[PDB]
Amino acid sequence: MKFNPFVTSDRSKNRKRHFNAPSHIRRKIMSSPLSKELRQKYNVRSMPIRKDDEVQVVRGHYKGQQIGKVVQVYRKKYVIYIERVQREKANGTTVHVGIHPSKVVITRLKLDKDRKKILERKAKSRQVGKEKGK
Amino acid sequence: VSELAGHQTSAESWGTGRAVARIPRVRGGGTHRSGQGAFGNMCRGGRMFAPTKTWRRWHRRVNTTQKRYAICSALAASALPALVMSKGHRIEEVPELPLVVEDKVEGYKKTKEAVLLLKKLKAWNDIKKVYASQRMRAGKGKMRNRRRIQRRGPCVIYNEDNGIVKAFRNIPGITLLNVTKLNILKLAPGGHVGRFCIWTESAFRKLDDLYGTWRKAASLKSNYNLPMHKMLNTDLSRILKSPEIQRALRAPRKKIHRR
Amino acid sequence: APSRNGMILKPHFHKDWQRRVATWFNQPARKIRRRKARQARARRIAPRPAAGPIRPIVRCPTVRYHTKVRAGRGFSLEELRVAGIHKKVARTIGISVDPRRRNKSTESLQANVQRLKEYRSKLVLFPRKPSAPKKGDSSAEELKLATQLTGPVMPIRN
RNA sequence: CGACUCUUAGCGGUGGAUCACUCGGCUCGUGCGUCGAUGAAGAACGCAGCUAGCUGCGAGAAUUAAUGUGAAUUGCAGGUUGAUCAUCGACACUUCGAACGCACUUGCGGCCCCGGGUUCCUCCCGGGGCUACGCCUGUCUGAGCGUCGCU
RNA sequence: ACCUACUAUCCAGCGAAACCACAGCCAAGGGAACGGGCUUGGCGGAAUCAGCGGGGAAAGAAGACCCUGUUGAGCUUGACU
RNA sequence: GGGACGCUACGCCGCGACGAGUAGGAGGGCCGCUGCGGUGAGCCUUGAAGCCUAGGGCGCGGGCCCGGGUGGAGCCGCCGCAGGUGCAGAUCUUGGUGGUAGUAGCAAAUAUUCAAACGAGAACUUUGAAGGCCGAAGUGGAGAAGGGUUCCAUGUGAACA
RNA sequence: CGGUCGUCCGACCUGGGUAUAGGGGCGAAAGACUAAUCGAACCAUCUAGUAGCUGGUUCCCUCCAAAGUUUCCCUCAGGA
RNA sequence: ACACGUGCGCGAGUCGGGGGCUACGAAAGCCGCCGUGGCGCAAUGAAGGUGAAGGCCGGCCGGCCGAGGUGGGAUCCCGAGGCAGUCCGCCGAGGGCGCACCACCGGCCCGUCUCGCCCGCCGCGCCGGGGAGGUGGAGCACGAGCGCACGUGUUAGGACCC
RNA sequence: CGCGACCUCAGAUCAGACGUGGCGACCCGCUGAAUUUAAGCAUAUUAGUCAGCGGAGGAAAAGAAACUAACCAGGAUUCCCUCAGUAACGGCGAGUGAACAGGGAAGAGCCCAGCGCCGAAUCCCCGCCCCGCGGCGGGGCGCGGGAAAUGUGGCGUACGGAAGACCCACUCCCCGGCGCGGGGGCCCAAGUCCUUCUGAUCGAGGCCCAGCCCGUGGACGGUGUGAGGCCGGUAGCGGCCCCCGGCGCGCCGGGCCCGGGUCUUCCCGGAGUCGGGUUGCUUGGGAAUGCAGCCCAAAGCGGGUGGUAAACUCCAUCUAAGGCUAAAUACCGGCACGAGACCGAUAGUCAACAAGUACCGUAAGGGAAAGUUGAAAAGAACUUUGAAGAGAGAGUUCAAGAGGGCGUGAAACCGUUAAGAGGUAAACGGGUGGGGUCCGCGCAGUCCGCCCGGAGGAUUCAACCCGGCGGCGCGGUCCGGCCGUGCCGGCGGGGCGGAUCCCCGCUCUCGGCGGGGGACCGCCCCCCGGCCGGCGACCGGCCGCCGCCGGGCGCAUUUCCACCGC
């Protein structure tokens, strides 16, 4: 159960927030878990994805162990585009197939001044549950 | 339904003649809704017959003695093994149906302790039955915040709260109830009686003070005693073949005399 | 059109009563609002009693009720004059005062004076400043034992 | 067997009935409970690279600044010392509109001050600040064979 | 009685509406007192075209002529207020 | 002094008599719809609801269960609860479709014909010629009110003419 | 709409502006006109006005089963 | 809102519905020194007001019996009898206590009419009251209502729909 | 006349400010019907109602008695229950219809005029200083101006107040400055683990000894059907970072010398106002309840009220004709929320969508219809006919039988294929018959028990021994526990209750009063003890009997399996 009286549990209202979320909220919804090798090193469960991140596909028709990078993040479709995840058009051109960020695991990140700042901050409060909780 | 529904339109019947059906109709206009029929429950749009009001008698009041009577009947039927089986509870491995547990479980603060307690008491099979009963609801309730339904589980009754509510509320089917504040809606779900109940030691001893015995009234109610029985020996099979009746009976006639 | 046997009834529904219909769905929410404001008031006057100032012993008019005793609006000036309490100082120490009340009897006048005498004994008065306790305040040990009184202060039992 | 016509079934046309879906209504409850001459509500007209409507905005015109956030927007081209979103406390806000120079033609003014125009010399042009009613205190200028006082 | 123009006729093209319980051959009988359906008889044969006004108590509009309503309106007066 | 069935007792069994029906009344529905509390360790992408069906059936009946096809995501049985719960009509409302019917009709103001160009396609477009009409109170040339891009060039024959 | 008609120098016709607004206007007078509406215009509301008067009133089975008669009512198409 | 019938809890009582205290929960539980108040427990009269059995014995007083009767009354009780000789149970002519309820005759309470004899006090009369016989009351005569729910019927509401 | 005050009255684009309008769900003050009912209708009722007008606020209004009552008296206003469908009004008809008291929510009181005392002791503006300056605030200086004696400020308001004398008592309250939880933002647990389906899994099985792991987190939503562990989230008195005034401390600029009791002397109240007559409206208010127009028009041991008009006489209760004031209360408008036994595109707001939009009327105004491809456009490349619209191949998809108004695609209606039939319009009920349609998966027709036969094959029967379990017992009454919706006893104890009978305190050491004993009685619980009953709404051990199971033997004329006779 949820106990916060100001937190919505309505189905129609929750779908309204999801489909009409602003762009800075759209990035937060598009978070994907890190690969298992990253997970002990950074102590971070999941993370929003950016334009240049190495991606394995876990579910769907394009799942496998192949390593591909993101092409662009299409926040209007809840869709990201991966390098070699693409299908053949009729005329001979190639079209990138959209994969939802939920069926995405990140094997390598895109380190930055603002990217690195979240890593200790997400790993800070991750530890706090192990001093206060213990 | 809103009281302005079907009444915001301005309409007037065309009267007799004009080969129309005398219904009030929309006053003019170069649109589809023009002379189309506004009022009446038979027409498209407009008011429906007998609009529901907010002042319908939603609530009902019950006598205090009758409210306390069903709780006594609900508690008494929870100690008979045959009635609880008819509620579907999978508790055939429970050692004693009046399940009385020590007062140490109030100090529980983790759900893993509560799960292990149910495994040790062999009541986990009813919670395991709850998992098999989880399915999305039939009908229009799925889009009205009633998407998922599940079976009732065992009810845990505690005298005092020291963390037992926190450690038990995450297990589905588990419903917590205070001793002084009982509820017939959670002791007899659906109107049927005989829900599986789990009691603590202080919970099990406080029942003699909230309702009393037949020779001593309740110490926490102002004026309340246990109701009397209409009949005492309810097993009429023992009564019917008892010797005292059997003398003053005629010979049974069981020879079939057809036409 | 009446039936065979029945009453003659006068239903007062010939006005436009459906517009003026007062539902009572606010009642469960109103009770919470009354309780929360009452609890918030008590914390504002945390040493003072939650009921408020004391009420006098009052006989009823309307001979139907003339054998009953209630709690009144305030103590009369004659009752305060005998008790030796100034009318402008009694209101600061939690005594209900009104100048409208009379004193035709002596038993009720003496009952409220006796009621005022036991209130002055039970009243723990804090000093104006904690640095300088004055003459008419309570002892220092009574400061540590000052507690809120739940319910009506000195309930009037018939 | 014919052509035509009747019944039933299959398939194909018209049609959107039924079902399942819902960023919408309806009802109830809680907190707050705030408009304007420092120009309200409302209306008109304009503003995007390609934009008819909707939405947003006001010549700084699908927004300026600041803060939070942190690698996009996207239908198509274009270009980390902060793109985009949200917050919004600074700045700005065309014309009517209580609407305020007179009227509502968008026409005519009046006063003061600046720049070309003078070389203040009258103009002309452009720009900036004022010019609605009633009323309160106070100031100034006044009226009265109203009541007087001193020459 | 005859002549002319535009229709009506047919064809190329485009193309509705009113109306429609089911639909439509009659004699007599009875019936709610004038039947397409019922009874007894006369009888009866695909699909149609151009006219035609006998019938469908034909289509048009909950009869305005008459009466009732304790339903109204315009008007008049020696009706009531 | 070693042995058939039975008995949801709101169940089972045996005797006799009776069975019309408008208005109207009552009772029984394991008749039907929707949602809620229980309940079926219920059904379900190895196929839910809905729909069609020359199949097998059940019940006097309201209706219901299987077989086949389509369909792609929910649904039902039992115990109680509650209702905006069952249509053939109301010159009912909304929407759709028929016979009429390829029918009435495309008939007010004298009239069009030939050749060439273009085009896939010409009675209706363009050019030339012929024959006509409006006959200056015009079927001519410009205004006001009103219309508001209808005015001009190019292109189209999707919708209208 | 066609033919046939009355008048066509004055009580003639007509454009624009303006004034008279509903129990009111205006009327060479017809109960005529007042935006296809006139023996009281149009829009919205009271209003879902009332109707002893017409029309309709939705699943099955079983059981029982009528009355158009008394009296009274401004009662006679209705009620008690 | 009312009437009747039915089901439930309590019972001469019954009830919080208004108010306080302790996700579902706006639920549920608790508070009668929170039962104020609603209905019933007493009616009658316009009102002032009044306001619900008697008998016997002894000499208006003192003791006793003390809650009406008759007929019909489902059920229960006895046993003349009968299923060498006792117990159980059976039934049984006949004899009784009689539930509810019906009919009748009485008795008591309030108003009214008529007729009297009287007594008596805190203020002795135009005073206060009793008695007897008729009559009117929606009365008494060993309670039955309260609260909730359901169904039907009549209404006021838009009121089966146009 | 000159000159100078003062009173009235003007002018300002004078200096500084104020009002206009909108919304209007709730509130206040006016105005204000007719539909309807009375089976007609006129008083009534609808109804102080709809409509119209003005004015605000976050609440408004009302509000601290010229009150209610007749009691042993209560004591501001507002709201709920009750009073009560009552008193009362009403062609006394339909109908209308309060108030007191009581229980609750809340509870806060006060200020003027006048009477008088203080030397106008008062206030506004302008200029200067100091300090904060988005509310120009305070204090100081003004022979700076003005208002005010046609009355400002302090004391002071019916509960009395003012002055003087006598006692008592603390002298410290309050403005403009500074330094010492709410709102917002960012994050925090655990499987995408093995097999298996699907186009995709969130579908199925498993993950033993931690029946995977987390759970104070198994609400919800999204992700290619159904997910606690994929993600956002959720839980948490969880973590981190900012803003807000706050609560109290300290410093200074500060005003700040204050009252209560006794005695004496004084003083003190609101005018075309109350009230009366009349008229109209209204109310339950009835010989006017309330409001309003006109006329008359007051008084001070006075005036008002005491629900029938009046006179006389006792009382009872307040002090009108001046004003302020939060809380309980209402809220179909607005801001931001949470929720639903509600409805599901002819439903639900008119409007789920470029909806008050398209469109209509000169105008006031009227006012629609309209959701769904697919998981992802992967939206059909390319070839060919046709001028093209449109096709035929090919291709995408799980599926084009989802191909751009595209999910599912019913009926009316139409086209085509198959079958049957066809001069009394068609259609229907009963009874057959014929033909199709698929089905029975029928095509050699039942098996089940008991007995016999012979072929076989077992580790096999009965009876004994051991162990466990269960049932019953009238064990005629074995022994012990536990309970009583059983009773009795008590040099018993407690906890209570009682409408049974010494001490602490107060208003007049004894008499009165409230509270606490103690004793007595009654109930409950416990220590027990004695009976009764039970363990079949509820029990154990020993003994006896019986049954079952497991293991040893017993070992084949016993027992159990398999096969056929027609």
- Closest nucleotide over all strands to A28 (CA to C1'): I232
B257 Rama sector, left if φ>0, alpha if ψ -120 to 50, beta otherwise: beta
Q: Which residues pair with B155 in a beta bridge?
A: B175, B197
Neighbours of chain A (3+ CB pairs under 8 A): B
Inform me whether the C-beta atom of residue C27 falls under 8 Å from chain B C-beta atoms. Answer: no
Q: What angle do CA B160, B166, B171 make, to 5 degrees?
A: 115
Q: Which nucleotide is nearest to B19 (CA to C1')?
A: F91
C22 touches chain B (CB under 8 A): no
Residue C72 Cα, gap to closest chain B Cα (Å): 29
Report the length, in residues, of chain B: 259
Q: Which residue has the tokens 């004026």?
A: B223
**Is A22 (CB) below 7 Å from strand D?**
yes
Which secondary structure element, helix H or strand E, spans residue A16, and what is its range?
helix A11-19
Which token pair is C95?
């005594």
B249: CB within 7 A of chain H nucleic strand? no
Q: Please, which experimental method was used?
A: cryo-EM
Cα gap A55→A105, rounded to integer Å: 6
Estimate the share of chain A in helix, then strand, then coil, as percent rounded to the nearest 5.
35, 30, 35
Displacement of CA C103 from its chain's centroid (Å): 20
Residue pair B87/B192 in contact by the 8 Å Cβ criterion: yes
Q: Do B145 and A1 touch (CB under 8 A)?
A: no
CB A30, CB A73: distance < 8 Å: yes
For chains B and C, what is the number of CB pairs under 8 angstroms?
A: 4
Three-state DSSP class for residue A82: strand
From the CA of B15 to the C1' of E34: give the distance in Å. 36
Nearest nt to the CA of B6 via C1' is: I350
Q: What is the DSSP string of B139-191?
A: SGGGGTT--EE-----EEEESS-SSHHHHHTTSTT-EEEESSS--HHHHSGGG
Q: What is the 3-state secondary structure (H, E, C) of chain C?
A: CCCCCCCCCCCCCCCCCCCCCCCCCCHHHHHHHHHHHHHHHHHHCCCCCCCCCECCEEECCCHHHCCCEEECCCECHHHHHHHCCCCCCHHHHCECECCCCCCCCCHHHHHHHHHHHHHHHHCCCCCCCCCCCCCCCCCHHHHCCCCCCCCCCCCCCC
Q: From B55, which residue of chain C is nearest by alpha-carbon distance?
A: C23
A12 touches chain B (CB under 8 A): yes
Q: In units of Å, what resolution does this entry have? A: 2.9
Q: Residues 59-118 of chain C: which lie with beta carbon within 7 Å of strand I? A: 59-68, 70, 72-74, 77, 86-88, 91, 96-102, 104-105, 107-108, 110, 114, 117
- How far are the Cα atoms of A47, A121, A124, B162 from residue A117, in angstroms, in the given order? 12, 7, 11, 41
Instruction: Tell me if residue B113 falls in helix, strand or coil.
Output: helix
Q: Is A10 on the interface with B (CB under 8 A)?
A: yes
Residue of A nearest to B110 (CA): A133
Nearest CA to A60 among A105, A107, A110? A105
How many beta-carbon pairs under 8 angstroms link A with B?
7
CA of B24, C1' of I32: distance in angstroms? 30
d(C-alpha B38, C-alpha B28), whole Å: 12
Token digits of residue B40: 């009446």
Give the DSSP per-residue string, B23-47: -EEE---SSSSSSS--SSTTSSSSP
